[PDB]
Amino acid sequence: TPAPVRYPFGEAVRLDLHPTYAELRERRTLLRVRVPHGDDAWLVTRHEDVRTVLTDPRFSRAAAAGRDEARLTPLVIRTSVMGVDPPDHTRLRRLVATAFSRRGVEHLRPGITALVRRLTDDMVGQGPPVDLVRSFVTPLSGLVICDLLGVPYADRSRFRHWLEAFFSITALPADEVAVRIEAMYGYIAELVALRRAEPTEDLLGGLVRARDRDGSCSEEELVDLANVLLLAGYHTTASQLASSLFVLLTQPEHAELLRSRPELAPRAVEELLRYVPLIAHVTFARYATEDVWLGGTLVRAGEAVLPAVPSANRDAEVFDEPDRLDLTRRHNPHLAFGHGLHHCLGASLVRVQMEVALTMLLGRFPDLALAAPPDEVPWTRGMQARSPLRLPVTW
Ligand code: HEM
Numbered sequence: 001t002p003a004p005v006r007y008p009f010g011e012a013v014r015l016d017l018h019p020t021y022a023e024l025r026e027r028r029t030l031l032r033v034r035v036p037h038g039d040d041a042w043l044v045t046r047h048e049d050v051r052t053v054l055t056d057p058r059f060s061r062a063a064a065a066g067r068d069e070a071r072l073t074p075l076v077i078r079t080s081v082m083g084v085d086p087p088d089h090t091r092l093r094r095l096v097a098t099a100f101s102r103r104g105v106e107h108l109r110p111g112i113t114a115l116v117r118r119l120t121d122d123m124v125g126q127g128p129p130v131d132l133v134r135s136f137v138t139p140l141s142g143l144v145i146c147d148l149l150g151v152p153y154a155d156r157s158r159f160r161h162w163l164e165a166f167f168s169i170t171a172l173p174a175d176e177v178a179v180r181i182e183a184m185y186g187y188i189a190e191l192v193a194l195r196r197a198e199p200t201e202d203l204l205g206g207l208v209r210a211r212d213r214d215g216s217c218s219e220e221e222l223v224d225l226a227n228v229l230l231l232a233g234y235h236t237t238a239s240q241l242a243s244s245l246f247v248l249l250t251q252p253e254h255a256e257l258l259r260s261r262p263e264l265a266p267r268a269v270e271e272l273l274r275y276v277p278l279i280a281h282v283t284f285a286r287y288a289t290e291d292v293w294l295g296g297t298l299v300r301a302g303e304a305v306l307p308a309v310p311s312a313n314r315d316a317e318v319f320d321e322p323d324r325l326d327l328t329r330r331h332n333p334h335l336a337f338g339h340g341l342h343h344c345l346g347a348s349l350v351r352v353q354m355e356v357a358l359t360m361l362l363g364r365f366p367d368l369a370l371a372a373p374p375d376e377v378p379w380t381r382g383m384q385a386r387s388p389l390r391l392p393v394t395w
């Protein structure tokens, strides 16, 4: 194999993609790389190629649990349904699929709408400037994931310390990663226990009933599944909505487009998912289980592949002018939610939260503008997802 290049190519800066990704797409080759932790891997960068590795059966995600997973984090993270192949993946997803369907999530829109109203009610009285990350983006995603799952949002003062340890690359040392992670796995266990004595009318309550009277999941599958849903809803969604708000407030000709044309919103939400590079670098690695050829490379059974999803979302062979934001694109086959088997489970819930919050922010602050130069806005350094630390605005 070729000499392995360091990966990452550098810290992810704001929302800029490193130039090597585009050259790799043009080269039509995988790149053998050397990551901060785990085995070496092949970096995958073309929309066509990232689709193959995300979902082809010959590329396994279970096979990486019996390995020191190529990865960017110090510790291997438990990814629940995201770390298993079928039939374990089937068995487990079916337990949460109906709650996260488009029809299932449509019922949450009246209350998501009303929260966005109560949150925007408060910027009005508070007055500029407002930190949109603190006063809006985090209360919205944080209160909508906790109310669906059953986690007390009023418990955020203890478990949002622990959520950062799952997303750290260089922000925390590995000993502080290991300890916050077990703090979280013991807070989840607290909640599972409080519901065998006191059944709840929430997603966690229904998962505990599902392990107890059906045995449809082991107890660590139970606690992992619930650990991962609050991971994704409380922080991954806030990152994307905080970064989409950066893209509109710094390219303010697109905020003016969508504000004058709110019917664009479902298209505007999709393109903001294609165009924002939410994943700092790569998604979860897969290991070949037999020999697959792609990207001018015979990947042998047992080798890793790292899918660089943000790069696939700029593939000129799929997206006309992929580096220009076009909030009005009609067909958007982006991979910002994954592809095939592991396609993002809260897809519909991210969309609804994003349609509502963008429509009302733009509708209700028609001259909303950043209260700093775009480059004076601070960004998450060392983290697995990209996000602005604060987002001061005025109107
Ligand atoms: C803007 C916010 C989000 C983004 C960008 C996002 C992105 C993704 C992506 C790209 C994948 C596929 C990963 C891969 O194959 O490597 C994925 C899988 C998944 N996502 Fe998220 N997600 C978001 C919010 C959420 C929310 C709110 C939930 C649940 C409450 C969620 C739960 C999941 C689950 C459970 C999986 C694994 C599904 C399976 O393995 O069948 N995500 N997500």
Ligand SMILES: CN[C@@H](Cc1ccccc1)C(=O)N[C@H](CO)Cc1c[nH]c2ccccc12
Residues within 6 Å of the ligand: 077, 078, 079, 080, 082, 166, 167, 228, 231, 232, 236, 278, 279, 280, 282, 283, 284, 285, 384, 385
């Ligand atoms: C290489 N995973 C990185 C990058 C990433 C990948 C996908 C989405 C967002 C960000 C990460 O931050 N992963 C975070 C932090 O561990 C956890 C996570 C994100 N999506 C998940 C789905 C199921 C279980 C866990 C997760």
